[PDB]
A paper describes a structure:
Here we show that the virion of [name] has a prolate head, containing genome and ejection proteins, and a tail, which is formed of portal, adaptor, nozzle, and tail needle proteins and decorated with long and short fibers. In contrast to other short-tailed phages, the tails of Kuraviruses elongate upon cell attachment. After binding to the host, [name] tail, nozzle proteins, and short fibers re-arrange to form a nozzle that extends the tail.
To form the nozzle, the four nozzle domains undergo an extensive structural change from the L shape in the [name] virion to the straight arrangement in the genome release intermediate. The same rotation is performed by the short tail fiber. In the new arrangement, the nozzle proteins and short tail fibers alternate to form a nozzle that prolongs the tail by 277 Å. Furthermore, the distal part of the beta-propeller domain of the nozzle protein shifts 3 Å away from the tail axis, resulting in a broadening of the tail channel.
Numbering used by the authors:
A (entry chain G): 253 to 374
B (entry chain A): 215 to 266
C (entry chain B): 162 to 266
D (entry chain C): 162 to 214
Write the structure that this text describes.
Amino acid sequence: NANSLTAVITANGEGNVTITADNGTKTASCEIVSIPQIDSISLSQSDVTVSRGSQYILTATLSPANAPNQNITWTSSNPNIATVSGTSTQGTINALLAGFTEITATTEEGNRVAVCTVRVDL
Amino acid sequence: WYSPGGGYSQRTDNDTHTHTISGSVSLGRDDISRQPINTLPPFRAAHIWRRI
Amino acid sequence: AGGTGGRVFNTIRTENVPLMTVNGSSFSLSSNTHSHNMVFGRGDASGHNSSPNWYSPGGGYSQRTDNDTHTHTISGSVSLGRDDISRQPINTLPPFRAAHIWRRI
Amino acid sequence: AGGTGGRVFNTIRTENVPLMTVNGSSFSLSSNTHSHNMVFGRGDASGHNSSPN
């Protein structure tokens, strides 16, 4: 801090770590566990049935109302069947006329793990 | 068959089914894949080993 | 504190309720229209919605328009399937809270 | 004793291999009346055991 008494912590990454202070004479210790955010997001729909050409627009609502610099690295398993883009909205535009695409979100600024949404073609 | 009475012809080739027919299907789901559990950043937190 | 330490009451230990998810996959089920065979006899009385077949009879005067030879197979797509596994038991109850030796030299 | 502690060969530890099962699912397929094609006309000659079309 400005007086050197306080210390502002910033857990940028993840994992357990210790933060020291008071370099003068005796130095104390204080553990700072960088536990994962695990802000579980939820897709608007999971069991969706897309059609040829038409792509039902989906969304990825996070557990909290908003996150600091929140963004989604949207991925689409079997990209030929369908693809998604954006962070909040998905836009699962289909290409193939049959298949199952496991469209799962991926929070770039947070935990990678996120809920998936299988887009059926029947 | 819609149970239609034949006006002139005799529909003797159509009849109800009383015994089930065995059908062969393809393969299906087997098991789930690997999934991530817990956070590596906060997992395995160090514990103080200082004696009393 | 104590001479020997461990992670039992407050620490990052192991053991928990297993949870997992399976990516969406397409399952194909083929409903073959053959091998149904024939049941019952000539009507008589026949139930509605019965699939009509042919007896391979030589029509003396009429034309058997309901009998034909198949040329290509029919391929169909089945619906979805299971999602993932359910909760499972982890660890043994009688061995629960087992002590771990951690005394130092 | 030893300064480092571990339970591999013989010790009262925790954690095991979880066992779970998936709920029963049935596969439903629709037998479409189209896409079966057609060859030739009224018999004539027809393949034995062929599906009626």
